From Swiss-Prot:
InterPro entries documented for this protein: TMEM14, TMEM14_sf
Protein name as it appears in the record: Transmembrane protein 14A
Family the UniProt entry places it in: Belongs to the TMEM14 family.
Organism whose genome encodes this protein: Homo sapiens
Tissue specificity note: Expressed at significantly higher levels in ovarian cancer tissues than in normal tissues (at protein level).
GO CC terms in record: endoplasmic reticulum membrane; mitochondrial membrane
PANTHER family named among the record's database cross-references: TRANSMEMBRANE PROTEIN 14, 15 (PTHR12668), TRANSMEMBRANE PROTEIN 14A (PTHR12668:SF11)
Bilayer-crossing regions: 1-21, 24-44, 79-99
Entry coiled-coil feature ranges: none
Length: 99
């Protein structure tokens, strides 16, 4: 949409994003951030919940279990997306290790 300066858009995007005061859809990802968060964070707290990493496993497991229809290649990205989430997590964990 519109073939105008990109960089600029990347600038305003970066800033605005940082200010976080525009979005407002709450499709699901958000819910994934909250849940996943508690998962990781909690695992980091070390109170009772299992250890990190595994948590994620329990996150995807619970979610899927909540869904009913286990992952399955098909239209939309509702199911696949989930896999994209868990994956994204792992990767982030690959670096987290260092962090």
């Amino acid at each position: 949409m519109d073939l105008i300066g990109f960089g600029y858009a990347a600038l305003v995007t970066f800033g605005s994003i940082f200010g976080y005061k525009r979005r407002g859809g709450v499709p699901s990802l958000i819910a994934g951030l909250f849940v996943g968060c508690l998962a990781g964070y909690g695992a980091y707290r070390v109170s009772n919940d299992k250890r990190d990493v595994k948590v994620s496993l329990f996150t995807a497991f619970f979610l899927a279990t909540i869904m009913g229809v286990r992952f399955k290649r098909s239209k939309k990205i509702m199911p696949a997306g989930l896999v994209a989430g868990l994956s994204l997590m792992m990767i982030l964990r690959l670096v987290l290790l260092l962090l």
